[PDB]
Each structure stands twice: as structure tokens, then as C-alpha cells.
């Protein structure tokens, strides 16, 4: 039922406003240990010999690396994505230039996506960056992805209940609730807001009085947009293991300036980045995936805030490998 | 000066401390020793509010705000401008409230009546302590307490709630809200009923105890009775804070997640998971 | 201590009284029975109950509304009885999610909600007639009915008057435990934080005052139960020492006092004002104010605070930022 | 353009704000606070001598009289002139305006302070249909003690000093509300009966404990006119007597507890 004291608390607004984090140490420790499994950087290698564009036969992304540099990458990729499966997950034992296994082609696009993240989305990932490990955590299927309908459990490494299974219709409300921090909000924030750029998150008017011409009847946004934004915010908070005051002074959710923390701006960039990733890198990959990876509408698994963050306000508590693997970005 | 029936009640005695020294009235007000301590604390607190408010940005009453210290000062004294005034004012408040309660027991003794009213007045004093003293003790800073300002204290209630994603799902809150609602409803019913019996209108004659009970038996099939509705009303009102205090004390010290998630004890039973 | 104020020490039994009303004396059904444990803290007699036309009409319409809600709820769990009990709190009947304006919504998107709203409203009106006419039948003033009227009026405000004034049924209160709770935040978020709505403030002021008054009034009567202060009607018409002491307790405490009758007017008025203030607030919201916080800023009332972590510009307004 | 805008930086909600305060203060000041004054007004000063004309504020603070049509005949009008006639056996302890009064005699018999009774009608309170409301069980023979509960009839009454003071002979019941309000008891060694409000009674299974008065003080409990019914003023006299004991039964009860 309850969590024993003490609680760790932080301050994120002026004194007296009750803004800041409330954290259970046990829970933080369990997440710290889970995230400390991040494999350490492989030892640096001397840049020696010709570029692998001249040495190997089918190297389209990593072509400016030397042989030892490139094989160091391939070791790191195997550690991050398929340590249990090994190099043969993506490769033919007898022909390392064969694209015959689908993980090869996907991994190539993932290489491009990852460098895109570290080069074009520094407004969100800063100097910390991502690697394949950030999402994959040592398995080819990342533990936290989303379909065009809610699935349970959130961690696909756990085995679903009959009711949790997406085909059991009697369990839909619970599948939806657990994605919105157990609220009864009747909206799926992922397909509404993170799958594409079609919907506006902001719903609150920016004037005191209602403007004539947007304020009556069918000119009005339905109230459901406000439910939906709230649902997105429940989901976002739960995905970072935090509460609203991490980003907002609830005195005025819609105001910036002194009424928002810098984390709110970073979160804003995060919404745009996730949209780019899903629309332009992850959703097109239903062409290249087996039918057992796709959802009930032939969609590929896509990313939300939890995919990288897994319940922590900084993924892997700020761990970085950017300086150790320049080939993953940023790219000049 | 005096109500037509008042003089025969204006007798000596019933004090708790000081005997005759403070046993007197000033206008309608009984004084007593706790009358004196109350005025002391009120004068001190209002002075500190005034001094603190003048060192602040504005004089608009809606925007004045005396705030507690940053969390980093823990449970220690903080510099006057950045939390100290809040600390001082808080102590005056407790002095004033407790004095006020004890003054009411003295008035009760002199009139030979029950002490039920100061007893009931303990509940809101207790709730004030839950918010400003006990819960900040459990968390380790006075910084978690609420600020003194007409509108600013609402911003604290606001953010405090959203620190647990949706406070409405707090079970102590649900209980508290339910007593606030039914208490307001019962008071309407009780006042409505009494007035309806004494004031039928039209020169019609005033009705009876039996009419009172007949009405509620007719409408809802039961009538708790005259004395009992007064006991129930004290019970209902008191439980706004008596049950609410659990939902407040729990948040932070004994629960750090959102309050919707707390209901997983029900939703996630494996039997029907 | 006066143990009588805690519970009845020695209970009494006697023949059941029946006050005759101008009509309907035969529509009292049931045989009265007595509960000894109830009788410790209250009156021991349960029943009979009056059973007029308006009361049955209320039960009829109410059950229809309940049934429409429960059926839609069960549809939400594809009629699995076990998941229905599990998920009960999270199930709901929703007004339209899409913007149809004031057009009648499809049954699958708000029509059933509108239906359940109609039958609940009829049930409330029917019960109101019961509350009113029962008073006149027994020769009593109609004070309760006018308080109850304000409470019904507030429900109509959040249920359909405010939707029709702004012109969208999408703004009604859903039916269900958690979902009617969720509406409060959606609404407050839409209209710019309800803490900054002065009529929220008024309503809360009166609601808190109802707690203050009923705690204070209840405590007062119990403190004078030894002199019979619970027999309030005859203390109104013939002031006894009970209400003299009650009046003098408050006068010597706060400097002024009520009478045994006027304290009930206070209480009645405070109760009424919870609902009247709430209704003015909803009636103004959306029709004449769009963001209550900005409205308080416009009129110079909102508090401001220093930044703690750095002030943060809206990134969407920086040059070259994506949409 | 804006819904709710008016000329020169006014909007409708701003006006309603003012109107709402005006409504509140009107009802509170001009209505409720005058209703509050239908008892005990006009106030009493160190002799209000101006018999020729009333002072203006005393007229302004009062509501128009209202008349109650009583259920068994009669009318009451409030407010009205009701000075307290009876001589009070109290003396001013000082010259100050709000100094307390002191009892000159025995305050329980003299009915001052917490022992004061109101001057209610010397009238028996009545049921809906005219009968006496508060009657002992010997008269109210269709009323019983509920099965479960002490029958006090026969039990002794122990006073504050631990002395048995009498024996409970009957319970008086409210026939309108089905609720016992008094015990009747014979005071031992005095050949008379006394009534006790239940609220002063600690009902145990072998005794009735009564802490408000001493055993000897049961002798001077106000007596009733009739044996089998009570008037509203008598109810006040009886109830007040024990309440006066809370402060007066012993010299130490009026002084500070600390
Ligand atoms: C977004 C945040 C929200 C929120 C956050 C919230 C928090 C954080 C807490 C509450 C609490 C409470 N909320 Mg809740 N809330 C409530 C109702 C309530 C109260 C019933 C309950 C107790 C308030 C209290 O402690 O007073 C305190 C009053 C006191 C202490 C009175 C002190 C008086 C003192 C003794 C004397 C003062 C004397 C003066 C200075 C003298 C001057 C007098 C002059 C005239 C001379 C309703 C009815 C709603 C609705 C309709 O939505 C709601 C929504 C919300 N609440 C939002 C969801 N609420 C409290 C609770 O119980 O939670 C379980 C609480 O801690
Ligand atoms: C846990 C949640 C709490 C809460 C949540 C809350 C909400 C959500 C709202 C209020 C509102 C109010 N609160 Mg607040 N509050 C207040 C006082 C106030 C008033 C400004 C106002 C109406 C109160 C009322 O009518 O009650 C009933 C009592 C009555 C009717 C008797 C009259 C009391 C009098 C009007 C109070 C005036 C006090 C003075 C302004 C302050 C003293 C000044 C000094 C210098 C003498 C005090 C004095 C305290 C203390 C000592 O604990 C307190 C604690 C809390 N409030 C907790 C922090 N309160 C409302 C408001 O409009 O604020 C702007 C409002 O919407
Ligand atoms: C984050 C969102 C919040 C919010 C959102 C909110 C909204 C949107 C509205 C309120 C409203 C109100 N809020 Mg507020 N709120 C309140 C307190 C209050 C109430 C005093 C007031 C009136 C509601 C009421 O009494 O309904 C209880 C009584 C009701 C609902 C009447 C029911 C009567 C009906 C006849 C009953 C009959 C039912 C049938 C028998 C059953 C049949 C059903 C079947 C057929 C299905 C407190 C004390 C706090 C604190 C401490 O923070 C708070 C914070 C919040 N509120 C946050 C700001 N609140 C209302 C208001 O005043 O706005 C100006 C309002 O409209
Ligand atoms: C500030 C003003 C307050 C206020 C005022 C007032 N509120 C009143 C009156 C006043 C003056 C009445 O005169 C009337 C009444 O009659 O009271 C005895 C009434 C009402 N307020 C109810 C509920 C409510 N008030 C709420 C709030 C506020 N109100 C605000 C706070 C809330 C909240 C907070 O959500 C709720 C849920 C119902 C009990 C009742 C209507 C039943 C009905 O409309 O029928 C609807 C028809 C049905 C079939 C529903 C059946 C179930 C219900 C519980 C009815 C069952 C009764 C039945 C007799 C049981 C038989 C038992 C028998 C076998 C032994
Ligand atoms: C469930 C229990 C209910 C309940 C019960 C009862 N309530 C009682 C009694 C009972 C039984 C009394 O016997 C007593 C009384 O006599 O009635 C007239 C009383 C009283 N209830 C008051 C206020 C009240 N009740 C509230 C709530 C409930 N009550 C709940 C609902 C609320 C809110 C917010 O809800 C308020 C504001 C005063 C009017 C009065 C105390 C006067 C005092 O104490 O004098 C002493 C103090 C002063 C005169 C001023 C002191 C100034 C200090 C030093 C400096 C200010 C500091 C302050 C903290 C700053 C705050 C700023 C602010 C904007 C944040
Ligand atoms: C200057 C100096 C040295 C003075 C010394 C003396 C001294 C201690 C003075 C104190 C000065 C102070 C601090 C005064 C402030 C007084 C205060 C706190 C007033 C608060 C008033 C408020 C806002 C009350 C809210 C409650 C309210 C609306 C009450 C209105 C209705 C009333 C009067 C209710 C009380 C009341 C109740 C509850 C009954 O049940 C009852 C039953 C039968 C008869 C009368 C009553 C009755 O009067
Ligand atoms: C999927 C996540 C892979 C795992 C595990 C391993 N490799 Fe890989 N490899 C992968 C891709 C998508 C590519 C193409 C790279 C590009 O820039 O286009 C490669 C390439 C190679 C090569 C060069 C082969 C050639 O074209 O001649 C070699 C030699 C190679 N990979 C070796 C290698 C080893 C030894 C691995 C286990 C340590 C390994 N790879 C894992 C995808 C994936
Ligand atoms: C989150 C932003 C990711 C990062 C960074 C990387 N990957 Fe990824 N990958 C991600 C998703 C959401 C998916 C879809 C689920 C799926 O299993 O397809 C994938 C998929 C792959 C695959 C295909 C594996 C399979 O389907 O069995 C491979 C081989 C893969 N990803 C490799 C890979 C590499 C090498 C990465 C770093 C260069 C990398 N991914 C980053 C999410 C994310
Ligand atoms: C940071 C990681 C956040 C947390 C935790 C919460 N919110 Fe949020 N919110 C955030 C951003 C970046 C934005 C802007 C979205 C955009 O695309 O522009 C928002 C927006 C809102 C809004 C809408 C405000 C408007 O202009 O209409 C609301 C009402 C809101 N947020 C509320 C809210 C609540 C209640 C939260 C805790 C449950 C919460 N947010 C968390 C960033 C972050
Ligand atoms: C991997 C591709 C990510 C996805 C998807 C999302 N985030 Fe992220 N975030 C990521 C990194 C590598 C970092 C850097 C950590 C650091 O040390 O700077 C971040 C940072 C944030 C922050 C800043 C938190 C802070 O304490 O300063 C926030 C508020 C944040 N992220 C929010 C957020 C949201 C709301 C997302 C979904 C829209 C989201 N992130 C996705 C990596 C990735
Ligand atoms: C002209 C026509 C077509 C349109 C106008 C129709 C019209 C007047 C519509 C009005 C609609 C209104 C007033 C809607 C208001 C709805 C509101 C305020 C709903 C609020 C809360 C609902 C709740 C809490 C319902 C929960 C439902 C359940 C728990 C299932 C029902 C079962 C029950 C046992 C009910 C118990 C409720 C409670 C006593 C515990
Ligand atoms: C809007 C509510 C309409 C409900 C109609 C059904 C109620 C019937 C009223 C009968 C009243 C008869 N009467 C006056 C003798 O009590
Ligand atoms: C609980 C919300 C209370 C907010 C009170 C704000 C009221 C502002 C009214 C302003 C009156 C108009 N004017 C001219 C003085 O600005
Ligand atoms: C926010 C709700 C406002 C409620 C206001 C009720 C206050 C009661 C004022 C009592 C005034 C006393 N007196 C003697 C000056 O009239
Ligand atoms: Fe009463």
C-alpha cells in the first residue's frame, strides 16, 4: 500500500510554491543499478591503414573509419543490441557483406537515425547523446516501445496476462490506464501526439476574454483536447519518473518565462525529436520487418519518452559515450 | 452594554489561570488570561506581517506573500527576509489559536456549559499543525510548508496537488471531500428544516418536533432526530480534517508516486489481472 | 462529562406517531421497525416511507439513467463480468469527444450521455416536487426546496447550461467515478486555473464556512443539551436558558451573537451560497472569461514570484524553431 | 473582438464581482445581523434615562417585529420588551463597567450565574395533539425502556462526595421525541422527590453517579408544582440547579484549576 520514509525532495520553484521532485530512495537505487549495466567504452584503437570504404565491400555509413576503428564499432553494436545472439544476428557467417538478414538493413538505418539524433537534436540530447544501448539495453527488441494501440506490459520482456493481451477487448481500459499513470483518462497520448505532428498539444487560451470567432459552437476545440493533453502529461511524467512541477509552475501551465523550468523547454524539443524519429526513421521500417514484429495494423514498433528514459529524468542518469564513439555523432 | 438577559450570568469564576486578575469583560468581550495572551500574539503576528510586507515588492493585498525558507535550510532558523519572518509569524499563529481555544473553555466554565465548542475548534488547529509543522518535520524542511498570502497559498495548494499527478485520487482527500460536501448539504437541510417549522408562512401556526421527524421519514424514510443532527453535524464537519489529515501526511512521507497509481493495490490483484 | 451528547444511555420505546398531512396519508408504505444500535446515536425508528407520485417518477427516471450508464459501462469491458468489477471506478459514459457544436451527437459518441443526462434531470425535478410538496402537505415552509433548487441549478450549469452557452456538448460532466473526477482538471486546465476564478473562491469560502458553522452550531447545542437546547423550536418561541447561554458564549467570545433562530438562517444562507456562487462562476466561464489566471493578471490581482531555476523562453517563439 | 468586453477596460465578469460583494454585504448586514437582534435587545446601559425619546441606533438595528402563531393557541412577538424583574442576589466586585458580579447568598437557591434560569412560560410543553410532552413512566404507561439498557428504577444515586443520596423511582420521557430526559429520585432522609436531567447522570448498571452536586445539596433542588407534569420554566429551574453546581458545589470549583 505505502512507501516507508524518508523521501528525497528537491526544489524547482521559489520557496513556498511546493515545486520539486519527490523520490523514494529504494526506487532510485533500483533504477541506478539497472542503468549501471551500461557496458563501459571499449578501449581506444589507433587509426591505421586505409578507410574501410576501400577495404570492405558494403560499407555505406561508416566508410571513413579505419579497420580497427570500424571493428571496434561492430563490437560495441553487438554488446549494445545483440550480446546474447552475437555477430551472426545481423550477418551471414560466410559473407559479412550480405544484407540477407533483416537486422542488417535495420541496423544500417538505426546507424543513420542514431547519428541524426546526436547531430540534429542536440537541443534535446546535448553533449550526453545516445547510443544503441540507450534504447535497446542489450536486446534486439527494445523493452519500451509503442504500437498504434496501447499494449501491456510496458516492458515487453515480461509475459502478458490473458487480459493484458491486446486481443482481449475486456482489458483495453486497463491497457490505457497504465499508459497514463493509472488515470481513467480515455485518450491514447501516443497515437494522438507522438506518432506524428498532426495535433497541437497546447489547449489553453492566451487571452483573458474569449476571442469572437473561435469561441462559439463548432469554432471551438472540444473539451476532449484538454483531457488528451492532460493524458499526455500524465504519461510524460510517468515516463521520466517525475511530477508536473519538474517543468511547470501549476499557477499557469500555459505560461513560459518564470513559470517554467528549463526542463520544460528541453521536453518541448523532445516532443519534436520523437515525432521526427517515428515519422522518418521508425515507422517506415514496417517494410523491412517480419510480420511478427508488426502490430495489428502492420505498424512497426515506435518510440516514446520511455523508450530512452525508462523512468529517469535523464536516460541512464546522464551516462554518455559520445566522446568514446565519435562515429555515432555529432557529424560535421 | 448588556443584553436584556445577560447580567445574571456575568459572575466571577471559571478561569483556568490567574483567578480574579483577568476575570472581567471589555465591552462584550470576556478577557481572562488567554484573552491577554491572544491579543499579545495577535499584535506580535500582525506586526511581523506588516514589517515583512513592507520589505516586499508590493502592497496589493491579493499579491502580498510571506514565504517559508528554501528547502536547503532544513529544520533550522532562516534569515528573516528569506523565511525567518514566516517562521516567527507561524509561532504567533499557534500562540493566537491555542490562546483562543483556551479562552473559550474559560467562557464555557463560567456559563456552566459543555466544552464541546473549544473541543471542536481543536480540529482546525490540528489540521493547521499537520500542514505547517508535522508534515514539514516528516520531510525535513520548513520549506515544505505553505506561504501566507491571499492568492499565494492557493498556488502552493495547486502545485502540492500536482506533485502527485492527480490529487483527486488521494483516498484521504476523497474521504475529506465527501465530508465537506455532505456537511454543507446537511447544514442546509438542518437549517431549512428548523426554519420551515418555525416559519410556515401565511399566518399558519408554527409546527412541532413531531412535524420535523414526520417530514424526513416521509421523504427519505428516516429521521435522526433533534439532538442527534447536532451530534452528526459536529461529526461530519470534524471529519473533513480528521480524515483529510491522513491523505496529507501520507503524501511525501509515505507515498512518492502519483495518487492514481496507489489504486494498483486493487487493479493489480493477480486473481483478475 | 455529559454522556448524553455522545450517545443515548437509556433508550425509550413507545407507540409510533404519525402526523397527518393534507394528502397522501395512505401512500405511506412499510411497517416501522427499530434498531437498537442506531438508537444509540440517533432515533431508533426506521420507516415507514411516503411513496407519492413524484417519488415514483423520480425512481422511474433515475433507474433509467442508471441503467443507460451501467449498460454503456459494461460495453466498455465487452461485458466481461469480472473485469467490470475490477475496472468499475475507471469506467464511464462520456459526452461527445468530437466537436458537433450543439448538434445532437451520435449514440456511439455522446448520444447515450445526453440521454442519461435527460433522465437524471427529470429524476431531479421529480424529487424536487417531492421535497417541496411534502413540506406544504405537512404545513411547513419551503426552505429546504429552495436550497435544493440551488443545488439542482448548479448541476444543470455544469451538465447542460454551460455547454449550451458556449455551444458544445463536449464540455459536459462524464458519468462515472474517476471520469467525473477527471473532468474537473480538464475543465480547470481549459479555463486557465480555477483557483483564479473569484466564484470558485466564493463557493469555497462558503463551503468552508459550512464546516465552521456546523461544527460550531453542533458543538454549541451539545454544550447546552443539559438545558434542553436540542428542542430548538420551543427555544425560538420561548427563549430558555439554553439559548441564553449559547448566545452569551459566542457574544463573549467574538463580540456579537445570533439567536437560536437566526443561526439557522446563517447556516441556510451559507449552504445556499456554496451553490449560487458556483453557478455564477460556471455561467461566466467560457461565455465571458477564457483564462481565469490571465483575467486576474489583467486586473492586477495575480501574485508573481522570482525565478528559482532560470526563466525559460517559449522555444516555439525562437527564430527557426520547428512547429 | 472579445465576448464580455465593455468600453474603457471593463468586462462583465469584473462587474459581477462588485455585484456579488454588494449582495453578500446586503444580506449579512441589513438582514442577518438584524435577525440576530430579535432577542435581548434593546441593550441595557448604566441606566438608560432618556425616557422621552429613543436613541437613533437602537431603532435602526432592530428588524420589524414578527409574530409566531403558537400551535396550541397564543401568539409571541419578537423582538419585545422583556426586562428581568426578579431581584438578583449579586454584588458588584468593583466600579469598572465589566467587572464580574459576586453571589451574596447561596447561588444555587438564589439561581444566579450558571444556576440562572430563563423566565420561560409557566406552561406545560405539549405533544402535537395537546397532551403533556414530558411525563414520568407511571403516567406514560405505553412507553418502555428498550431491551438492552439499564432499567434505573431501584438503583441508588451517588453524589460527588460518594454518599448515596437517594433512589431512582421513575424516568420522565419526551413523548414527542421518544427520548428520556429526566430521572426522578427520592432524596433519602427528606421525604420528597427530585428530578435530574439525564445529561447530569452517569448511568452505571448498579448505580447512577452524579458529579455536579453534593449529596446534601439534593435537598434544595427546585420542586415542581404538580407531581406528574412539568412547566418549561420548571425544566429551566431544575436543569440550571445542577449546572450551578459545576461552578459552586464546592468553594474550589470557582477558583482556578491551576
Ligand atoms: C491541484 C490540487 C488540488 C487539491 C490540493 C489539496 C491539497 C494539497 C490538500 C487539499 C486538502 C483538501 N481539499 Mg483539495 N479539494 C477539495 C477539498 C479539500 C478540503 C476538503 C481538504 C481540506 C482543506 C484544508 O486542509 O484546509 C485547511 C484549513 C485550516 C488549517 C483552517 C485553519 C484555521 C485556523 C485554526 C484559524 C484561522 C484564524 C484566522 C487567521 C483569524 C482571522 C479571522 C478574522 C475574521 C478575525 C474539493 C472540494 C476539491 C474539488 C471540488 O476539486 C479539491 C481539489 C484539489 N485539492 C485539487 C485537485 N487539497 C487538504 C487535505 O485534507 O488533503 C487530504 C490538503 O492538504
Ligand atoms: C490545504 C489547503 C488550504 C487552503 C485552501 C484554500 C482554497 C482552495 C481557497 C481558500 C480560500 C481562503 N483561504 Mg485558505 N486559508 C486561510 C484563509 C483563506 C481565505 C483568504 C479564503 C476564504 C476562507 C474562508 O472563507 O473560510 C471560511 C471562514 C469564514 C467564512 C470566516 C471568515 C474568515 C475570513 C474570511 C478569513 C480572512 C483571513 C484574513 C484574510 C487573513 C488574516 C489576516 C491577519 C493580518 C488578521 C487561513 C486563515 C488558513 C490557515 C490559517 O490555515 C488557510 C489555509 C488553507 N487554505 C490551506 C493551505 N483556501 C479561498 C480564497 O478565495 O482565497 C483567495 C479559496 O478559494
Ligand atoms: C484542478 C481542478 C480543481 C477544481 C475544479 C473545479 C471545477 C471545474 C468546479 C469546481 C467547483 C468547486 N470547487 Mg473546486 N475546489 C474546492 C471546492 C469546490 C467547491 C466548493 C465548488 C463547488 C462544487 C460542489 O460543492 O459540488 C458538490 C455538489 C454538487 C455537485 C451538487 C449535486 C446536487 C445534486 C442534486 C445531487 C443529486 C445526485 C443524485 C441523487 C444521484 C443520481 C445519479 C444517477 C442518476 C447517475 C476546494 C475546497 C479546493 C482546494 C482545497 O483546492 C478546490 C480545487 C479545485 N477545484 C482545483 C482548482 N472545482 C465548482 C465551482 O464552484 O466553480 C466555480 C465547479 O464548477
Ligand atoms: C450546498 C448544497 C448541498 C446540497 C443540498 C441538498 N441536497 C439535497 C437537498 C438539499 C437542500 C434535498 O432536499 C434532497 C434530499 O432529499 O435530502 C434528504 C437532497 C439530495 N441530495 C442528494 C445527494 C447529493 N447532494 C450533494 C450535494 C449538495 N446538496 C450540496 C453540497 C451531492 C454531491 C456532493 O455530489 C450528492 C451525491 C440526495 C440524497 C438527495 C436527492 C435525491 C434525488 O434527487 O433522487 C434521484 C433518484 C434516484 C432513484 C436516486 C436513488 C439514490 C439516492 C441516494 C436517493 C435514495 C433515497 C431513498 C429514500 C433511500 C431509501 C432508504 C430507506 C429504505 C431507509
Ligand atoms: C472542520 C472544522 C472547521 C472549523 C471549526 C471551527 N472554527 C472555529 C471554531 C470551530 C469550532 C471556533 O470556536 C472559532 C470561532 O471563534 O468562530 C467564530 C473558529 C474560528 N475559525 C476561524 C477561521 C477559519 N476556520 C476555518 C475552518 C474550519 N473551522 C473547519 C472548516 C477556516 C478555513 C480556511 O477553512 C478559517 C479561515 C476564525 C473565524 C475563528 C478563530 C479565531 C481566532 O483564531 O482568533 C485568534 C487569532 C486572530 C484573531 C488572528 C491571528 C493572526 C495571526 C497571529 C497572524 C496571521 C497568520 C496566518 C496564518 C496568516 C494566514 C494568511 C492566509 C491568507 C493564509
Ligand atoms: C482590545 C482588547 C485588549 C481586547 C481584550 C478582549 C479580547 C480578547 C478581545 C478579542 C478581540 C478579537 C480578536 C476579536 C475578533 C473576534 C472574531 C475572531 C470574530 C470572527 C467572526 C467570524 C468571521 C465568525 C464566522 C462565523 C459566523 C459567520 C458567525 C455568524 C453567526 C454567529 C454569531 C454564530 C455563533 C453562534 C452559534 C454557532 C450558535 O450555534 C448559536 C446558537 C444560539 C444562539 C447564538 C448562537 C451563535 O451566536
Ligand atoms: C546488427 C546490429 C549488427 C551486428 C550485431 C554486427 N554487425 Fe557488422 N555490420 C552491420 C551493418 C548494418 C553493416 C553495414 C555497415 C555500413 O556502414 O553500411 C555491417 C558491416 C560489417 C563489416 C564490413 C563488411 C563488408 O561490407 O565487407 C564487417 C567486417 C562486420 N560488419 C563485422 C562484424 C562483426 C565481427 C560483428 C560481431 C563483432 C558484427 N559485425 C556485428 C550490422 C551488424
Ligand atoms: C531509440 C531512439 C533507438 C535507438 C537509439 C536505436 N534503436 Fe534500434 N530499434 C529501435 C526500435 C523502436 C526498433 C523497433 C523494434 C524492433 O525490434 O524492430 C528497433 C529495431 C532495431 C533492429 C531490428 C531488431 C529486430 O527487429 O529484431 C536492429 C538490428 C537495431 N534496432 C539496431 C540498432 C543499432 C545498431 C543501433 C545503434 C547504432 C540502434 N538500433 C539504435 C529503437 C532504437
Ligand atoms: C517536462 C518533462 C514536463 C512535465 C513533467 C509536465 N509537462 Fe506539461 N508541458 C510540457 C511541455 C514541454 C509542454 C508544451 C507542449 C508543446 O508541444 O508546446 C507542456 C504543456 C502542458 C499544458 C498545455 C499548456 C498550454 O499552453 O495549453 C498543460 C495543461 C500541461 N502541460 C500540464 C501538465 C500537468 C498537469 C503535468 C503533470 C501531470 C505536466 N504538464 C507535466 C512539459 C512537461
Ligand atoms: C532518446 C532518443 C530520447 C528520447 C526518445 C527522449 N529523450 Fe529526453 N533526453 C535524452 C537525453 C540523452 C537527454 C540528456 C540527459 C542530460 O544529461 O542532459 C535527455 C534529457 C531530457 C530532459 C532534461 C532533464 C534534466 O534533468 O535536465 C527532459 C525534461 C527530457 N529529456 C524529456 C523528454 C520527453 C518529455 C521525451 C518524450 C517527448 C523525451 N525526453 C524523449 C534522450 C531522449
Ligand atoms: C434537449 C435534450 C436532447 C438535451 C438536454 C438534456 C439535458 C437536460 C442534459 C443534462 C445533463 C446533465 C445535467 C448532466 C450532468 C452530469 C453530471 C454532473 C454527472 C456527475 C457525476 C456522475 C457520477 C458520479 C455517476 C457515476 C455513475 C455510476 C457510479 C454508475 C451509476 C450507478 C449508481 C449506483 C449511481 C451511484 C451514484 C452515487 C450515489 C454513488
Ligand atoms: C420536470 C419534472 C416533471 C415530473 C412530472 C411527474 C411529477 C408528478 C407531480 C404530481 C404532483 C401532485 N401533487 C401536486 C398533488 O403533489
Ligand atoms: C480566488 C480568486 C480571487 C481573485 C480576486 C481578484 C479580483 C479582482 C477584481 C478587481 C477589481 C477591479 N479593479 C478595478 C480594482 O481592478
Ligand atoms: C468568502 C465568503 C465571505 C463570507 C462573509 C461572512 C462574514 C461574516 C461577517 C460578520 C460581520 C460581523 N459584524 C458584527 C461586523 O456584523
Ligand atoms: Fe440547530
mmCIF file of N, CA, C and O and ligand atoms in Angstrom, chain C residues 23 53-54 57 61 122 125-126 129 133, ligand 12:
data_model
loop_
_atom_site.group_PDB
_atom_site.id
_atom_site.type_symbol
_atom_site.label_atom_id
_atom_site.label_comp_id
_atom_site.label_asym_id
_atom_site.label_seq_id
_atom_site.Cartn_x
_atom_site.Cartn_y
_atom_site.Cartn_z
ATOM 1 N N UNK C 23 -52.640 15.559 2.227
ATOM 2 C CA UNK C 23 -52.947 14.464 1.327
ATOM 3 C C UNK C 23 -51.901 13.374 1.492
ATOM 4 O O UNK C 23 -50.923 13.519 2.232
ATOM 5 N N UNK C 53 -46.576 10.205 -6.055
ATOM 6 C CA UNK C 53 -46.365 10.125 -7.500
ATOM 7 C C UNK C 53 -44.979 10.638 -7.891
ATOM 8 O O UNK C 53 -44.244 9.969 -8.630
ATOM 9 N N UNK C 54 -44.605 11.830 -7.407
ATOM 10 C CA UNK C 54 -43.328 12.417 -7.800
ATOM 11 C C UNK C 54 -42.161 11.519 -7.397
ATOM 12 O O UNK C 54 -41.191 11.379 -8.155
ATOM 13 N N UNK C 57 -42.007 8.712 -9.888
ATOM 14 C CA UNK C 57 -41.493 9.264 -11.134
ATOM 15 C C UNK C 57 -39.985 9.440 -11.042
ATOM 16 O O UNK C 57 -39.246 9.073 -11.964
ATOM 17 N N UNK C 61 -37.348 7.534 -13.609
ATOM 18 C CA UNK C 61 -36.373 8.236 -14.442
ATOM 19 C C UNK C 61 -34.946 7.972 -13.983
ATOM 20 O O UNK C 61 -34.037 7.813 -14.814
ATOM 21 N N UNK C 122 -34.795 14.801 -15.204
ATOM 22 C CA UNK C 122 -36.188 14.547 -14.865
ATOM 23 C C UNK C 122 -36.289 13.950 -13.472
ATOM 24 O O UNK C 122 -37.172 14.323 -12.687
ATOM 25 N N UNK C 125 -35.857 16.895 -10.995
ATOM 26 C CA UNK C 125 -37.096 17.658 -10.916
ATOM 27 C C UNK C 125 -38.193 16.934 -10.155
ATOM 28 O O UNK C 125 -38.875 17.522 -9.308
ATOM 29 N N UNK C 126 -38.380 15.642 -10.446
ATOM 30 C CA UNK C 126 -39.404 14.870 -9.744
ATOM 31 C C UNK C 126 -39.136 14.852 -8.248
ATOM 32 O O UNK C 126 -40.048 15.065 -7.441
ATOM 33 N N UNK C 129 -40.078 18.133 -6.562
ATOM 34 C CA UNK C 129 -41.507 18.249 -6.291
ATOM 35 C C UNK C 129 -41.854 17.511 -5.012
ATOM 36 O O UNK C 129 -42.644 17.993 -4.188
ATOM 37 N N UNK C 133 -43.587 19.580 -2.112
ATOM 38 C CA UNK C 133 -44.969 19.291 -1.745
ATOM 39 C C UNK C 133 -45.064 18.598 -0.386
ATOM 40 O O UNK C 133 -46.000 18.860 0.376
HETATM 41 C C1 LIG E 12 -39.874 18.235 -14.640
HETATM 42 C C2 LIG E 12 -40.489 17.213 -13.676
HETATM 43 C C3 LIG E 12 -41.789 16.636 -14.247
HETATM 44 C C4 LIG E 12 -42.213 15.414 -13.418
HETATM 45 C C5 LIG E 12 -43.693 15.062 -13.633
HETATM 46 C C6 LIG E 12 -44.167 13.954 -12.675
HETATM 47 C C7 LIG E 12 -44.485 14.530 -11.290
HETATM 48 C C8 LIG E 12 -45.979 14.455 -10.966
HETATM 49 C C9 LIG E 12 -46.308 15.534 -9.932
HETATM 50 C C10 LIG E 12 -47.540 15.173 -9.100
HETATM 51 C C11 LIG E 12 -47.755 16.230 -8.009
HETATM 52 C C12 LIG E 12 -49.182 16.114 -7.455
HETATM 53 N N1 LIG E 12 -49.372 16.905 -6.239
HETATM 54 C C13 LIG E 12 -49.275 18.327 -6.546
HETATM 55 C C14 LIG E 12 -50.683 16.617 -5.662
HETATM 56 O O1 LIG E 12 -48.369 16.581 -5.312
#
